[PDB]
Design a binder for this molecule. Structure first.
Ligand SMILES: O=C1c2ccccc2C(=O)c2c1cc(S(=O)(=O)N1CCNCC1)c(O)c2O
Ligand SMILES: O=C1c2ccccc2C(=O)c2c1cc(S(=O)(=O)N1CCNCC1)c(O)c2O
Ligand SMILES: O=P(O)(O)OC[C@H]1O[C@](O)(COP(=O)(O)O)[C@@H](O)[C@@H]1O
Ligand SMILES: O=P(O)(O)OC[C@H]1O[C@](O)(COP(=O)(O)O)[C@@H](O)[C@@H]1O
Ligand SMILES: O=P(O)(O)OC[C@H]1O[C@](O)(COP(=O)(O)O)[C@@H](O)[C@@H]1O
Ligand SMILES: O=P(O)(O)OC[C@H]1O[C@](O)(COP(=O)(O)O)[C@@H](O)[C@@H]1O
Ligand SMILES: O=C([O-])C(=O)[O-]
Ligand SMILES: O=C([O-])C(=O)[O-]
Ligand SMILES: O=C([O-])C(=O)[O-]
Ligand SMILES: O=C([O-])C(=O)[O-]
Ligand SMILES: [K+]
Ligand SMILES: [K+]
Ligand SMILES: [K+]
Ligand SMILES: [K+]
Ligand SMILES: [Mg+2]
Ligand SMILES: [Mg+2]
Ligand SMILES: [Mg+2]
Ligand SMILES: [Mg+2]
Lengths: 424, 425, 436, 418
């Protein structure tokens, strides 16, 4: 069996509670997290965190997405920072245990329409192969259309995360979310544009709506602010990070903490440590029930397979859900149901591998073996690659159950199969 | 379409509370799904004719009960032969062939403390004549079930033992009896004389709830349509009793004198069919599925894990059916325990398993007769296609419907581990 | 376990094993069913009223006394049979049997008199025979009219008009007997005092296999509206000739109570059968078992969630009183009422505690039998000089009568519901009292 | 609608979050009490008047600093500032005085025995007992308060691993708990403090005992006029977690913006209280609160249920010790619990319970006890109207007892205002 020790870890006594109040009462500081940290960390790369050596430490500490703030620096300065990130990421390619994709995100300076500087910076993003754009001061759907148009003929695959920073963005949230790939709760400007005491309402509302829509949401700004000068955060800062994860944020961010502060690596380590504790404290019993009840009926096989796979994973306490994905969409649809099981996404797309860091609980594995002549063999090889990577990384052991999600034919858009495999 | 969402009590199904679900039940919302609660009809003088048996099979009889409290072995052997002749008369059309189980209902212990000598002889007769199920009378403890099992011998290991709970001791030792039985029958005739009549509904509801929780079949029996022994139409209490047995969670409903000796055996079957179909649509699946999942323990059995994933997937897309390949019936039983609204179409080569799965609510057995294809994946596909073609012919499926297909990774029982979303073409 | 541990130590484990209390404490409806226990004996007084049809087999004063003792709360007179003279004599016999127990509130049981109309026959509305029978009802002081074949709101307006100025206090229970009555249910319920699910005609007018849907829907809507609903016809049919009912019949009675019926009815079983008293005893025995098996935890939660917010102090006090009663496992809720309305508003929340309704109105005492769990106590003392003393005396009468009848025991907690000024409509006070 | 009522009507917690609206203005009075530490930056009578107007309900004196003479002068200044508003009885706001002990350091220390004696002699209402790690620590504090300090509330500060592990035994003998996050965040891993906070708040809510969230809630406001985004989030989340009180330490004791820090906690708490998902919270609290034969417990749940049914503007309760108001507060009604008491100490102490608004009764007594009760209820109504809690046409729930003295609450009445 699994043993009594298994059921005492990862807040499992609080997970089995019949009410949210009982769940809180059962949270235990001695119940150690076991699962891999699922909330991605976005770290802003600037003066304090640009060197290849420092970037290697940031990657080891847990950085998944490197943010470049185009309100500062120049194209040349940010191109060097991007090259340093890619050099630091590729320095781990000689070890499957440490190699991890890192997304590159361009955060625009901001705005009548798109500013001339934003057009040029978005063009720089396309030319430098950025994965994500954090679009500043998105106030309406037409702002997203303008950013999308500026990403032009080569950059349509770039994810647009709309930053909600003012009253209009909050009021027109639904129309903005509908055309965006995701949202950033940009609390710095939001806290100056609307009363500071109302920011938590906008944050909780936007995270809730993104969770309902199945689109990534980032919580940003001043999460560990005091760590710009101090080696340890305040009690409010650790609480803020934990509560952003409990609210439902897919990603958490560091700005000045990593861009210009004295402890960039420590700030990343702190977000990693808190997120892991907070993820185990999520009350999945209610969350899954509510996500299922609110999500409409669907005839899309990927969506149908995803909910079946997440339900199967909860039934057996599956160590992982291994999914084959070319665009990341099948992994994103699993992530929207918030499984406790890690979603190991095996993909040949380096871009999709970097971009799926936007979805909570997705662990991308970039697959580079040449395609097998028999498609069923190529699928089996990728599933075994996910399993062997999971064993090497500590997600899986022999005797564990894993859920495996695939499609009936090659190419994106055909996911329709869920299998239950015993790890051998 | 909007027409789809007005049928099968779908407005009541979408209600946020059980009270609002009741308020939204509509007599004009027609049932669409195939009737999922199996009908057990007792064989007797009113229903022994081969031609009458053909009408009973067409009316909806799924299990033929042989009551060994009446008649000799020669009588029951002729009943079995007539049942098999009527059932096999439809085998020439494999896409519409309906398996029918044969169940032997024992006389019981009488004044004795356990298995009677007549029950030993009757059980051996059952094994020799290939009966599918034993309804063991007056089961009072786990050792009664062990004695029935021992009396079936080495050749009767595959026969299902449904323990009849008929007295206070059987109700009190219910958990130990259920643990060793394949299922239970709430034998209300004797139960209503052994305990106060006004307490039988408590024992019925409790046993049905516990069987639903255990994922084991439960039968509601006796006097369900009693007045139809002599009258062409049942009383208001009888139609209510049948509907409430289905709403309670009974996998099967039974007819005794109504089919064994009455003047309306076919009409009694038709009446149970009509009521069960209306009552199944009136089940509040939102609460039932939530409570079955919450109560069902965590499992590391891949068949069980695939079954809950498949049922969840079926609810997500309003799947017309879950097509499952099964050797023993177990993969279909594990789907049935989650009470999907989608029909569980069970494709099997085992004639016995096809008959026995009628014990599980919502399982529609299809007996596949073709010998195995040389390539196993082709053999699996042909059986899934047989499930689809049978489903289209019977009205379960249409082009454009979504179905969930449940199969395993290798031949042989015990390896179900795959769930697939398929569009019917 | 922790939510009941202190009360389990105080009241004892025997208390918590009775009246399906282990099933009552279950967290899900499925667990509640699994915990139903045939050895868990009912303790509470039977709350679902029994309507018995009085006819040839049950007309004698001697037999009527046995029927009252067996549990009959409402006597039904079926104007499809007999005559005005025949029914007047049955009514006089019922009143003689009822008044034979009038020497004390411990023995007195008010029994309502209900007139069930012949109906419109082939006509579009109120027939001439119904006009005459309704006038007979008013002249003979009937408490309730079971109006046959109500198909729309104008049918109940016609019955109301035929009762005249003297019959304004008579309750109109609309019988839903056909497809149109089911389809126009909401408009009919709005203008009626309650509904009868008249399954005999309903089962011939619509497919027999659909009657249970109409029954469950109408009971649910009446429970939501807080108006009485009667389940009727063939509940114990075989008892017309047999001393024991079938398994389907006992199931039907239990399920009508579990569905939420305020009343259950006997027709031929008491009007013409060989076992009228035994049929009443059987409905009494089944209804007490089924009432204990109600899953109050979900029922109360759903009645709260569905019932709209209210600014009516009687309604606000009623929900507070029912909540208080559940918190302490109160033996009873004693309520002072002039029209029965304050007791009806307590009854709509389905407390497990008996609602002891103290009233000076003999008619309201008979009519409140339509509401589940209301036990009417007719108070006959003239008003005290000080109104607050008169209120206190009526509460003490409820307490003393309750103790002498086993509803209350010394040490029990009782919830008392009263108002701030005389007259109907001013209930606004809830008090928790310890019985000494 | 106002006070997040569209989010309040949601059928799931997820839909409730989706319906939260920054334009839905709070209307209800701020329920979560603010504890402000009184020190060098907030000692003056003039500053204390501004702190009281800003929303300070409890003045904390940190006995780790200053001296008996320094703290006695702070206490006198607090009382002078509080009493400067007593000329208006319908609007008078009581303010509790809480003594926070220095702690055991390396049983009960000799400095704590002297400071606790000082507390009793100066009539403090509450003791925040530092580093409580077991039930015997609470017994020692109680013994040190002596026979004259029987009425002082002991709020045990949970500051280390042992206090968290022995939480149940500590809560059982304490009047309430303080999640003292400063030391807790150094004694256990910083990333685990939120788990201890949420667990302790949940258990206190279940026990119906006050819980205080403390330390670094608005830390940056010691030097900056506006807090960080994490600080406003922390305050809001402490309220959403279920904290009865929120605290300011350095922000008011030594910072440059003590009044602004109080105003910020007030503004956030009011917004967060309206964002509480009462539908789930009430259902869970009501389900978990044990069955009881105590008439005050029975009346309290009946009154809270009645208040929710009619959207009551307030529950007016007469209380001698504060207990009847505390039992109403444990069910977290949206309706303000207006507690009318003659006890000045109970009026100050009842600030520990969320949503209890104490009114100190100083009107002449009525000869007949029933008449006296009616005028205390009319006092609650008149004070409620003046303060904006009540308007003509509102419904209120009134909770009283059957005889004088504490422990006899057993009546709930539905009253229409004016
Ligand atoms: O990237 C730079 C940078 C690059 C080149 C030269 C100087 C700077 C610089 O000075 C810098 C940068 C970024 C940020 S931030 O932390 O991203 N930012 C603070 C909150 N608002 C939005 C997010 C800075 O705080 C910052 O000062
Ligand atoms: O009241 C009488 C009666 C009075 C005078 C003389 C003979 C009879 C008589 O014979 C009688 C009566 C009543 C019922 S019933 O059961 O209430 N009822 C049958 C049809 N309508 C619906 C319900 C009878 O079944 C019945 O036969
Ligand atoms: O998530 P996406 O982008 O739709 O990709 C899922 C696809 O991956 C697969 O599992 C494997 O496809 P490939 O062999 O083309 O990589 C498909 O069967 C499925 O349609
Ligand atoms: O329900 P059971 O008895 O476990 O049978 C399920 C089995 O049926 C199959 O789908 C098909 O097996 P066969 O080809 O042997 O019939 C297996 O893969 C699976 O293990
Ligand atoms: O239930 P009803 O008909 O509203 O009667 C309740 C009324 O009874 C009382 O308790 C007593 O009134 P009376 O003294 O007129 O009988 C009133 O205070 C209250 O308004
Ligand atoms: O909340 P507490 O301390 O129990 O006080 C409630 C008490 O207050 C009262 O309402 C009024 O009592 P007093 O007149 O003594 O102030 C009592 O009837 C009740 O017992
Ligand atoms: O731009 C941002 O990230 C902000 O304003 O918080
Ligand atoms: O044996 C039976 O079927 C019975 O007694 O009901
Ligand atoms: O009239 C009735 O009572 C019926 O039809 O059931
Ligand atoms: O003592 C305290 O308040 C702390 O450490 O947080
Ligand atoms: K920017
Ligand atoms: K038999
Ligand atoms: K009639
Ligand atoms: K201190
Ligand atoms: Mg900004
Ligand atoms: Mg029997
Ligand atoms: Mg009729
Ligand atoms: Mg400390």
């Amino acid at each position: 069996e699994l043993g009594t020790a298994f059921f005492q870890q990862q807040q499992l006594p609080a997970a089995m509670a019949d009410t949210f109040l009982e769940h809180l009462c059962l949270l235990d500081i001695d119940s150690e997290p076991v699962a891999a940290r699922s909330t991605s960390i976005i770290a802003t790369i600037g003066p304090a965190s640009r060197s290849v050596e420092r970037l290697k430490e940031m990657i080891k500490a847990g950085m998944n997405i490197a943010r470049l703030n185009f309100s500062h620096g120049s194209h040349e300065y940010h191109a060097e920072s991007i090259a340093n990130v890619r050099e630091a990421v590729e320095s781990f390619a000689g070890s499957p245990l440490s190699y991890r994709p890192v997304a590159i995100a361009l955060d625009t300076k901001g705005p009548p329409g798109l500013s001339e500087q934003d057009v040029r910076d978005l063009r720089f993003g396309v030319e430098h192969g950025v994965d994500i754009v954090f679009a500043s001061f998105v106030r309406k759907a037409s702002d997203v259309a303008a950013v999308r148009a500026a990403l032009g003929p080569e950059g349509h695959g770039i994810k647009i995360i709309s930053k909600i920073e003012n009253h209009e963005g909050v009021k027109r949230f639904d129309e903005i979310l509908e055309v965006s790939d995701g949202i950033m709760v940009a609390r710095g400007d939001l806290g100056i544009e609307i009363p500071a005491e109302k920011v938590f309402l906008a944050q909780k509302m936007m995270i809730g709506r993104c969770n309902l829509a199945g689109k990534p949401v980032v919580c940003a700004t001043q999460m560990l602010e005091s760590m710009i000068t101090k080696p340890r955060p305040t009690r409010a800062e650790t609480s803020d990070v934990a509560n952003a994860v409990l609210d439902g944020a897919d990603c958490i961010m560091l700005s000045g903490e990593t861009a210009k502060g004295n402890f960039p690596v420590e700030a990343v380590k702190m977000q990693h440590a808190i997120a892991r504790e907070a993820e185990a404290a999520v009350y999945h019993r209610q969350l899954f029930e509510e996500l299922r009840r609110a999500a409409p009926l669907s005839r899309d096989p990927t969506e149908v397979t995803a909910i079946g796979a997440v339900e199967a994973a909860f039934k057996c306490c599956a160590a992982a859900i291994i999914v084959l994905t070319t665009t990341g969409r099948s992994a994103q649809l699993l992530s929207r149901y918030r499984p406790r099981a890690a979603v190991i996404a095996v993909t040949r797309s380096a871009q999709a591998a970097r971009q799926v860091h936007l979805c909570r609980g997705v662990f991308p594995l970039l697959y580079r073996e040449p395609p097998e002549a028999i498609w069923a063999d190529d699928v089996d090889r990728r599933v075994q690659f996910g399993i062997e990577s999971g064993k090497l990384r500590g997600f899986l052991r022999v005797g564990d159950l894993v859920i495996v999600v695939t499609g009936w034919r090659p190419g994106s858009g055909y996911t329709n199969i869920m299998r239950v495999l015993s790890i051998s």
